[PDB]
Amino acid sequence: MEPKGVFAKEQSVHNEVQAEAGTTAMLSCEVAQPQTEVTWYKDGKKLSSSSKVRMEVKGCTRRLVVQQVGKADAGEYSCEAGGQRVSFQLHITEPLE
């Protein structure tokens, strides 16, 4: 057993979470089909640069490492891959301190 479809959801990103800005999240993806296309969407729409973002491509391993340090970068993160979609919602919650 191993195949499931395009892009394996080995990403700690697939749910609604509300937390203060500064939460580090790493997306790990292992695609079953190489036809997978690399295409990420920010806050649902391509905005300006804010949070730290880096691309790591090597063979079939496709992983985007993003650190939520910018509040402005908060928004809908939809990860597309060939023929698959990911649903995640980041909300900035002021400290309860």
Which positions ≥6 away from 81 have C-beta within 8 Å?
6, 7, 29, 31, 36, 37, 38, 39, 62
Structure tokens at 18: 């509300």
Residue-range domain boundaries for the chain: 1-97
Residues found in the chain: 97
The two tokens of residue 68 are 């939520």
* Method by which the model was determined: NMR
- Contact between 47 and 25 under an 8 Å Cβ cutoff? The reply is no
- Which among 57, 5, 53, 61 has a CA at the least distance from the CA of 30? 61
Place of tokens 């919602």: 89
Contacts of 88 (CB under 8 A, 6+ apart): 13, 14, 15, 16, 17, 76, 77, 78, 79
Say if residues 19 and 89 touch (Cβ distance below 8 Å).
Answer: no
Q: Which of 93, 85, 65, 77 is nearest to 6 (CA)?
A: 85
Q: Identity (one letter) of the amino acid at 58?
A: K
Q: Return the biggest CA–CA distance within the chain.
A: 47
